[PDB]
Structure 1
Amino acid sequence: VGEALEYVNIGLSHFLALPLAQRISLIIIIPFIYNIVWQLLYSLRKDRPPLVFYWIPWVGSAVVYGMKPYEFFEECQKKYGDIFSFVLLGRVMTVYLGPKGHEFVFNAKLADVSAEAAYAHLTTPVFGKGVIYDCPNSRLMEQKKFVKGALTKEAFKSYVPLIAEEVYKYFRDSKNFRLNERTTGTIDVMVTQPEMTIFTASRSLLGKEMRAKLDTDFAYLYSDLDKGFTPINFVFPNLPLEHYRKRDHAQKAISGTYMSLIKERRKNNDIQDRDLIDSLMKNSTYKDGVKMTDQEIANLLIGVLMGGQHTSAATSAWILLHLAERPDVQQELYEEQMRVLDGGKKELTYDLLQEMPLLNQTIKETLRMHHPLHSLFRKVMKDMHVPNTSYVIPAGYHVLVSPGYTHLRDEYFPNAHQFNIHRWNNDSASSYSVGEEVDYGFGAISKGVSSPYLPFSGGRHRCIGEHFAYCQLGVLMSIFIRTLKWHYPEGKTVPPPDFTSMVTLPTGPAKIIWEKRNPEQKIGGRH
């Protein structure tokens, strides 16, 4: 022990007498070996889920997870069961697959897990400060409450003809259609659907002013900001590059535009019940008296529009793509449209949308096969014991839940990779609380979150956009169906998802060929 500790000090010193060709090369090799040693040691633990073995420190299973998460989850499930962890770019993600995982994560106590600590870097740089994940959970709960106030049956009743008008205007004016001058055409659905989504959501949620603005070069800011909404933000939220400056600039310029409208309306007391802007002007005071600022209101609007943008656009693209090889479904949907709208002699209303179950089943089935968000996260805040196991998930870990994975299991949905809207006969609702309920601040929602079908999650972070989504997707598809037939270019089929984008959007270029059902029909109005 005497000469031992001396040779420790000697050894520390001889280390520095190494050529750096050796010293840098061991600066790499040492973490690599400890990593493997720590993993081998880790596997001993009884109070830890199996950890997926990986070679590269820090990076972890990022590549295979990133490129094909559901295949990754399937392989891990086979070897280890439903609970397992894996390292991902410096973090430890504990996956819990299936309905019990949904319960473990979505109904976890506010104290145990944090969504804002998982998500804030993704969103705060894009939306702005003070809202959504840049604030405490109870602020979020009430912001969801505020937004829900513009998402009522009466609002949907007034949105439908606005959304309809936008779809027709797009058919009339967009270079991708121009139905008054073309009877057939080819389109990339990842060009047309993001455009139709932003036009329809602008007009209805933001109002005529902000929609009007999309016909100016102001539209280039949306693109700039949109490009800033990327999973890279999870790792690099701010880097001194043109991309990040374009984004930052856009967030300032767009929120400034919203603030201009807001202050303009208040100045004239032109505060009605037209749109989400009016709504948040009348109704954005928290339960402790603090009022949202005009800046926070605008940042909230950006997030809502942005979130709704990507989930919905990706979804209507997938609907288009699945219907492109299924002329039978198109036909079936067309007949439902003729019946409900009396051969087209009835105008589409919100109430009539509700009497189109096949259409709604089509949305529902698309969301089963193409959950836009394949992985939902929470950062673990307090150590968590996994019920009926010896597993304890320690603070500093992340829990990862994936209803999108369960959506694609045959055990829960027979023939899960087949598109079949009739699996939802007797069950065309977007979702519905199968039993008892609970209120976190934005309204009574289902207490249990064990449904195998769960595109809108559940618990305190449950989506509040599902009825707006169905309204938007519904009006849009109703008009697509009554106006066009479409199919694939010869030899093409449904693309595989891109699991590396923000949403599980189709892999490009995803093209379909459209043709007018009534070549002679004209869309009125000015252009």
Structure 2
Amino acid sequence: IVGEALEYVNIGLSHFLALPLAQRISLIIIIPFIYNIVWQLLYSLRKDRPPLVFYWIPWVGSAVVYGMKPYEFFEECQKKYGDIFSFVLLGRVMTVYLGPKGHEFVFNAKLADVSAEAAYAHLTTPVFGKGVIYDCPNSRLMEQKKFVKGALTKEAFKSYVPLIAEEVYKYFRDSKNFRLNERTTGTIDVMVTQPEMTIFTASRSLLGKEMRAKLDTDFAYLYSDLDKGFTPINFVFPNLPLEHYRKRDHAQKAISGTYMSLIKERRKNNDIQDRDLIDSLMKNSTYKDGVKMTDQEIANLLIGVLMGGQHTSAATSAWILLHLAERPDVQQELYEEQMRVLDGGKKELTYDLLQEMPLLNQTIKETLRMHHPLHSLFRKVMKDMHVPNTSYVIPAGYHVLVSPGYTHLRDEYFPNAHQFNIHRWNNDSASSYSVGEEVDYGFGAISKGVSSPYLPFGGGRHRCIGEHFAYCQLGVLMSIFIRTLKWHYPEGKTVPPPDFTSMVTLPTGPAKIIWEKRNPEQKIGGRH
């Protein structure tokens, strides 16, 4: 009789409920652990799914090894399963597509197939504020990028260069890390100096003199507070009743308030010029459907732009210094270019003269190859995607993960990829260049193909608009570093490994270099 079997399901259920809590809280952990191992083995038999990396702890997935060393994880996975493979990350399924075909599959994915804001909104909305970037539909983001880029013109760059140069020299004069009028040599942590130099140069040029003046006050602490809110933790715990979260949110309110204060005072005096990004968004932030951005949204977009460029740029100048510190040959070669292009230093550095410095630009270009600030770019898959020339279907609710930074470091696309060699870019010093046809998603013509193995600024609709600002900033900064200082490592030190757990792939610190003045008796003028 099978009826007697069902009685014993009932009985056995009643006996299960009566086991000691030693056994039951055992069995609450044992049952999903074994059910997970069963589900994976069954999953491995589906041929319409990319291979899934095996993991033990349910939900947590491969998070630990991915988070700590993602390029090593990808290379081991790539040897095992080829270029397309999935792995489980703190509750989500990430499908990785390595190589140029992966750049194409993700960066050029149809707007209806994937969503960046669905992957990213919790990462950034708590830090930037509401209504901008990833807290708004894609069509709003596109036009927001059009607004910001409209202030990022070559004529803006010609005016930013002397301003950035003034900040770099101010920092050499006044910062405790240098004091070039009092000290001719010294030790700095590049992960202390570069964030400060970056925010000082970016504030002065994009935000204007008033906002730059605030960082000389206690207001600087709010920037520090807000900056600590910029962490990948926000992926999992975006809001918590802790203290870190309170100063972050306070700082966002306080900083966006200072921006709205300045915006509302410029409009009441009609003090609206072409000075900085604030003027620019004030004159040009009405969407095509007629909606104006609010003063709050404009301020929030300013925080997003300044914050993103802060961490990519600061990490990149740190890496440039760290690589050059063990390459006095490269510093020497860069210095000769500076003497030739600037008539032994008797020409004032201009945006135009920066474009005549191919080796300096190639040094930035090579640093960005070896240290892509963003090792992984995410999209949430919104409807099922067929992976061309496979039987693979990526179902909706998965995520796709693209990693041009991994391809940057492959010998097949960059011979001797782990060697720093700026001369691999000889007669190719452009920050990037569209290898053919262009398309415009709402913020300007950009390259249509994204199959280049070198993609420091991504591609497609979510492509960076900061590239020329970053090269302007990095170029002025490194031109002055080169002309002012030599530097090298403390004894037995070398290039640190990256910190992949962070918001960008910044160097693991402290990472110290010893600078020395090229001209001990050179003084920097001005009052302090």
TM range (shorter): over 0.9
- What's the secondary structure of 2:215's corresponding residue? helix
- Provide the rounded CA distance (Å) in 2 between the counterparts of 1:368 and 1:10: 65
Deviation at 1:15, TM superposition (A): 1.2
Compare 164-173 and 7-16 and name the one that shifted more: 7-16
Deviation at 1:456, TM superposition (A): 0.2
- What's the secondary structure of 1:498's corresponding residue? coil
- Provide the rounded CA distance (Å) in 1 between the counterparts of 2:11 and 2:128: 55
- What's the secondary structure of 1:93's corresponding residue? strand
- Provide the rounded CA distance (Å) in 1 between the counterparts of 2:451 and 2:72: 22
- Provide the rounded CA distance (Å) in 2 between the counterparts of 1:60 and 1:254: 38
- Provide the rounded CA distance (Å) in 2 between the counterparts of 1:10 and 1:126: 54
Per-residue CA deviations over 1:71-95 (Å, capped at 9, x if unaligned) read 0000000000000000010000000
Compare 12-21 and 277-286 and name the one that shifted more: 12-21
1:424 maps to which residue? 425
Deviation at 1:14, TM superposition (A): 1.6
- Provide the rounded CA distance (Å) in 1 between the counterparts of 2:8 and 2:51: 39
Structure 1: 5+ residue stretches without partners = none
- Provide the rounded CA distance (Å) in 2 between the counterparts of 1:6 and 1:272: 84
2:171 maps to which residue? 170
Per-residue CA deviations over 1:294-335 (Å, capped at 9, x if unaligned) read 000000000100000000000000000000000000000000
TM-score by length of 2: 0.99
- Provide the rounded CA distance (Å) in 2 between the counterparts of 1:75 and 1:514: 39
Per-residue CA deviations over 1:141-179 (Å, capped at 9, x if unaligned) read 000000001100000000000000000000000000000
- What's the secondary structure of 1:400's corresponding residue? strand
2:374 maps to which residue? 373
Deviation at 1:7, TM superposition (A): 2.1
- Provide the rounded CA distance (Å) in 1 between the counterparts of 2:55 and 2:525: 61
- Provide the rounded CA distance (Å) in 1 between the counterparts of 2:11 and 2:277: 71
2:31 maps to which residue? 30
Deviation at 1:426, TM superposition (A): 1.1
1:394 maps to which residue? 395
Per-residue CA deviations over 1:104-130 (Å, capped at 9, x if unaligned) read 000000000000011111100000000
Deviation at 1:2, TM superposition (A): 1.8
- Provide the rounded CA distance (Å) in 2 between the counterparts of 1:77 and 1:10: 50
Deviation at 1:266, TM superposition (A): 0.3
- Provide the rounded CA distance (Å) in 2 between the counterparts of 1:145 and 1:25: 57
Per-residue CA deviations over 1:174-219 (Å, capped at 9, x if unaligned) read 0000000000000000000000000000000000000000000000
- Provide the rounded CA distance (Å) in 2 between the counterparts of 1:10 and 1:101: 54
Per-residue CA deviations over 1:247-288 (Å, capped at 9, x if unaligned) read 000000000000000000000000000000000000000010
- Provide the rounded CA distance (Å) in 2 between the counterparts of 1:328 and 1:381: 51
- What's the secondary structure of 2:486's corresponding residue? strand
2:304 maps to which residue? 303
Identity %: 100
Q: CA RMSD for the aligned pairs?
A: 0.5
Deviation at 1:337, TM superposition (A): 0.3
Per-residue CA deviations over 1:204-242 (Å, capped at 9, x if unaligned) read 000000000000000000000000000111100000001
Deviation at 1:11, TM superposition (A): 2.2
Deviation at 1:5, TM superposition (A): 2.5
Per-residue CA deviations over 1:451-478 (Å, capped at 9, x if unaligned) read 0000000000000000000000000000
2:228 maps to which residue? 227
Deviation at 1:13, TM superposition (A): 1.9
1:275 maps to which residue? 276
- Provide the rounded CA distance (Å) in 1 between the counterparts of 2:4 and 2:129: 61
2:150 maps to which residue? 149
Deviation at 1:16, TM superposition (A): 0.4
Deviation at 1:10, TM superposition (A): 2.2
Deviation at 1:9, TM superposition (A): 2.2
- What's the secondary structure of 1:24's corresponding residue? helix
- Provide the rounded CA distance (Å) in 2 between the counterparts of 1:249 and 1:118: 25
Structure 2: 5+ residue stretches without partners = none
TM-score by length of 1: 1.00
- Provide the rounded CA distance (Å) in 1 between the counterparts of 2:523 and 2:372: 36
- What's the secondary structure of 1:215's corresponding residue? coil
- What's the secondary structure of 2:181's corresponding residue? coil
